[PDB]
Design a protein around this ligand. Structure first.
Ligand SMILES: CCc1c(C#N)c(SCc2ccc(CNC(=O)CN)cc2)nc(N2CCCN(C)CC2)c1C#N
Ligand SMILES: CCc1c(C#N)c(SCc2ccc(CNC(=O)CN)cc2)nc(N2CCCN(C)CC2)c1C#N
Ligand SMILES: CCc1c(C#N)c(SCc2ccc(CNC(=O)CN)cc2)nc(N2CCCN(C)CC2)c1C#N
Ligand SMILES: [Zn+2]
Ligand SMILES: [Zn+2]
Length: 842
DNA sequence: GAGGCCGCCTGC
DNA sequence: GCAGGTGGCCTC
């Protein structure tokens, strides 16, 4: 009792398409939505749109089902509106007998007045439902967790009766994934030359720059097998009784495992080998490139990288043939003297830009002029920055050219004053953001200081980082902690988003924002954005990959209004230690990644502690002079950038905490070799600067787990080294050069690795802290050579702040301002992705 | 106000 | 077990 209605629309092969069918008491036509029975009766019904109806000579009565995704199957899980569906590129042929019923599915489109329709209370944002039939508003990418406006793919007259948009988009994706050759230049003896080729939607022509993996080719300058570090030569165990705790071969902050950046070539030929009959084998695409040298690839090796621009290359006449499938992306490489602009303007004007001024001759180990054949606005968004701090995120967005931060909210006054000092045109509110929003919603125009409150339409971009105090555990919500979340600053920030409805929205936070409360904080944040009707996504970024010598992972939530394009996450710019670049996120057993494809290498070398601060003058422990001489010119590219173009005769805030006499003696005895920390301290008496004496540490109890030194000395410093015995107060020792508490509890704290630890010139900072303390958790705060902790200026350099960026207050206030900020280079990379969306808006 | 002192959880 | 990820609070 399955009956076709009418004559066949088209007969193709063993298929006869129809526009309408009758099943029992119902009639179905293309475009109708149906439910479909699953094998597991416990599982819910599948829902689909019918995109075609045909009789098959071998399969019987058939239709094409374009499946909807239930909201509960997305990252939103159980927080989803129970009747919300999402478009996905999932579809298949199916027998008509599997249809259970016809269902109503409504497209809930945002209205033309969407930007004025905000103001629902937090309960409505978090838990409110549409309360109607099935509906969709957004398309969903299940691997990247992206909610976007539905695609506008269009059918022709050759497919209108059977058009499946999912089939069409999948076919486009497949074609985009396959390398192809387009033009045709010449036919040689054993190969065919081509003028252009395409890969992953990128067009490559003869003469373009290509990124290649570091293994793609070698240079004529082969290598120098370095004198490797020996196997930890023995030390005097009586002099250094805690050195045994360094049995791990892992050094915090070391760049020994960072990969090489990309090889860079200029396409000389694009070609295919010929078949036996003369035709080209276009499944086998090759390119011949000229090799570019980075400075560190010449005979001068790594030190050549110290002073050179990070995008400086050297031309050479060496050539390599590589598979086209190895290309990692396209880049622009230009001879510097032929630019219509200076090198700095060129380098700041776009991505993937390199330049060369000379050619390198490997045979002669010399430099030459390149050969002739090597030659050949947008209005800013009015931005509100909530929980701005001193303004690192706003500074990076400003550098990207996308925003003017006209309003900022910062409750901690020294940070608010710093933000004002750097942004004279902005209005900085110090009130509770809840109070400010309530005033705006009540129709107030100015706050109690006479500052004008932003109104609907004023705010075009909203960014901030809300604290998660009270719900930053990993365990599941309960009634109390869920109430704390509902009344929290995260939800207040979401309320700002709902009321103002900016074009773009950014929430930044610590990495574990994606995992707090079994990922429910993340899921609810996304749920609120979708409930407002925003496009949105999330991901994790590593700041070191965008140009700071610092490991700092951040969770990022991005949203874009209906009518906008949802931004992509920025591709890594700098290679960085892979152990610090774990960006994936597991939510309810589903592993999510961002759109980022640079997982193994990148265009630029890693930024080091040397890059960051080798130019700063020597200062002492407790340095307090607020304005001093730099004592020399900037040395590295990074320093040239951060000092800026205008000559700065005064270096500011190169001041350090005044550590006590005992702490200073300890710092003076930490060796300079990489990986040095408290475990390298000698066990000696030392006279302190205040006349007092630092004492030897005595070993008073036998530590069965840790054994004894080679002279038979014990290794415990307290009775608690026994199984169940408590701590003996008489066993506590004071004013020892080796701190008593570190051997006291080291066995359960990974030997307190990194406390009193030195940075290394070749390595990177641990996450820049708000108050550098050698015996705190983030204790690796000692200068690579000087006997002091890092200065405020050095922390600001680790964050990528320009040297001209003003700070405010006492030294601890300035450290906290620096340590709480988003690094401007990270903020700038994100902002450039938003700029791409602004320019591409349809 | 410094600096001594040092829990709990998770991914691998 | 190893390494990372969240700082506060005595005591004076
Ligand atoms: C978010 C990923 C996802 C999405 C997305 N996106 C979808 S789309 C809905 C849909 C897609 C395809 C079919 C065809 N049948 C098969 O694929 C099995 N051979 C039916 C329904 N469904 C999902 N569920 C429910 C459908 C059936 N299971 C695969 C269980 C997983 C899941 C999941 N986790
Ligand atoms: C037991 C702790 C808890 C937890 C935990 N753990 C959670 S998880 C968040 C969540 C879970 C399920 C849904 C589905 N409900 C819908 O309505 C869908 N639109 C939405 C959100 N939520 C909670 N409350 C409270 C009232 C019930 N409401 C759901 C609001 C949220 C509570 C609580 N007390
Ligand atoms: C390794 C250093 C360390 C550290 C370090 N670092 C920490 S941090 C603890 C912490 C405090 C506040 C927040 C903020 N709270 C929210 O945000 C609300 N959700 C988070 C974590 N605790 C430590 N113990 C445990 C707590 C304090 N004593 C009981 C003993 C010492 C220790 C130690 N030894
Ligand atoms: Zn299809
Ligand atoms: Zn003890």
């Amino acid at each position: 009792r399955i009956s076709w209605v009418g004559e066949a629309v088209k007969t193709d092969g063993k298929k006869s398409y129809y526009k309408k069918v009758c099943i029992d008491a119902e009639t179905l036509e293309v475009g109708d939505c149906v439910s479909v029975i699953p094998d597991d009766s416990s599982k819910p019904l599948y829902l689909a749109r019918v995109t075609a109806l045909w009789e098959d000579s071998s399969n019987g009565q058939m239709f094409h089902a374009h499946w909807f995704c239930a909201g509960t199957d997305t990252v939103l899980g159980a927080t989803s509106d129970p009747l919300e569906l999402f478009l996905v590129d999932e579809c298949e042929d199916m027998q008509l007998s599997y249809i259970h019923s016809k269902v109503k599915v409504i497209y809930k489109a945002p209205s033309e007045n969407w930007a004025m329709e905000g103001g629902m209370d937090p309960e409505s944002l978090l838990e409110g439902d549409d309360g109607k039939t099935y509906f969709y508003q957004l398309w969903y990418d299940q691997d990247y967790a992206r909610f976007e406006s539905p695609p506008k793919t269009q059918p022709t007259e050759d497919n209108k009766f059977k058009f499946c948009v999912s089939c069409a988009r999948l076919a486009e994706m497949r074609q985009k994934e396959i390398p192809r050759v387009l033009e045709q230049l010449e036919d040689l003896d054993s190969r065919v030359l081509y003028y252009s080729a395409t890969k992953n939607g990128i067009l490559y022509r003869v003469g373009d720059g290509v990124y290649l993996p570091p293994e793609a080719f070698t240079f004529n300058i082969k290598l120098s097998s370095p004198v490797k570090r020996p196997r930890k030569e023995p030390v005097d165990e009586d002099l250094y009784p805690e050195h045994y705790r360094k049995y791990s071969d892992y050094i915090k902050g070391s760049n020994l495992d960072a990969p090489e950046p990309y090889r860079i070539g200029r396409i000389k030929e694009i070609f295919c080998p010929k078949k036996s009959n003369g035709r080209p084998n276009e499944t086998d695409i090759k390119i011949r490139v000229n090799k570019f040298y980075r400075p560190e690839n010449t005979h001068k090796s790594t030190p050549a990288s110290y002073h050179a621009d990070i995008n400086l290359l050297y031309w050479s006449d060496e050539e390599a043939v590589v598979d086209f499938k190895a290309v990692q992306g396209r880049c622009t490489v230009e001879y510097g003297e032929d630019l219509p602009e200076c090198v700095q303007v060129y380098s700041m004007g776009g991505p993937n830009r390199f330049y060369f001024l000379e050619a390198y001759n490997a045979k002669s180990k010399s430099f030459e002029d390149p050969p002739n054949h090597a030659r050949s606005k947008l209005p800013k968004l009015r931005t509100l920055d909530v929980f701005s701090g001193c303004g690192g995120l706003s500074e990076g967005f400003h550098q990207a050219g996308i925003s003017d931060t006209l309003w900022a909210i910062e409750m901690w006054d020294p940070a608010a004053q710093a933000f004002r000092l750097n942004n004279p045109g902005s209005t900085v509110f110090t009130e509770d953001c809840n109070i400010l929003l309530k005033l705006v919603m009540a129709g107030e125009t100015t706050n109690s200081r006479g500052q004008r409150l932003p109104q609907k339409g004023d705010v075009e971009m909203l960014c901030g980082g809300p604290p998660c105090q009270g719900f930053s555990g990993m365990n599941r919500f309960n009634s109390r902690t869920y109430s704390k979340f509902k009344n929290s600053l995260v939800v207040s920030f979401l309320s700002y988003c709902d009321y103002y409805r900016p074009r773009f929205f950014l929430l930044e936070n610590v990495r574990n924002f994606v995992s707090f409360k079994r990922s429910m904080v993340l899921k609810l944040t996304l749920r609120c954005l979708v409930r407002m009707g925003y496009q949105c996504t999330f991901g994790v970024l590593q700041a070191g990959q965008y140009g700071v010598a610092q490991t700092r992972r951040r969770a990022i939530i991005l949203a874009a209004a209906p009518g906008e394009k949802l931004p992509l996450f920025p591709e890594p710019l700098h290679v960085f230690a892979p152990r610090a670049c774990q960006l994936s996120v597991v939510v309810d057993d589903k592993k999510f990644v961002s759109n980022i494809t640079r997982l193994s290498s990148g265009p630029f070398r890693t930024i080091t502690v040397r890059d960051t601060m080798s130019d700063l003058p020597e200062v002492r422990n407790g340095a307090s002079a607020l304005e001093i001489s730099y004592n020399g010119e900037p040395q590295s590219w990074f320093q040239r950038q951060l000092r800026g173009a205008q000559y700065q005769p005064i270096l500011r805030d190169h001041i350090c905490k005044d550590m006590s006499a005992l702490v200073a003696a300890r710092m003076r005895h930490i060796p300079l070799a990489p990986g040095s920390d408290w475990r390298d301290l000698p066990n000696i008496e030392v006279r302190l600067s205040d006349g007092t004496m630092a004492r030897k540490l005595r070993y008073t109890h036998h530590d069965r787990k840790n054994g004894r030194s080679s002279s038979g000395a014990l290794r415990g410093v307290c009775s608690c080294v026994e199984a169940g015995k408590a701590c003996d107060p008489a066993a506590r020792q004071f004013n020892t050069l080796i701190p008593w508490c570190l051997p006291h509890t080291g066995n359960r704290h990974n030997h307190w690795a990194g406390l009193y630890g030195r940075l290394e010139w070749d390595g990177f900072f641990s996450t820049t802290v708000t108050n550098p303390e050698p015996m705190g958790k983030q204790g690796r705060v000692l200068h690579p050579e000087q006997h002091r902790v890092v200065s405020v200026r050095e922390c600001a350099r680790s964050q990528g702040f320009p040297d001209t960026y003003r700070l405010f207050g006492n030294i601890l206030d300035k450290h906290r301002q620096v340590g709480n900020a988003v690094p401007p280079p990270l903020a700038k990379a994100i902002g450039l992705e938003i700029k791409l969306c602004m320019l591409a808006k349809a």
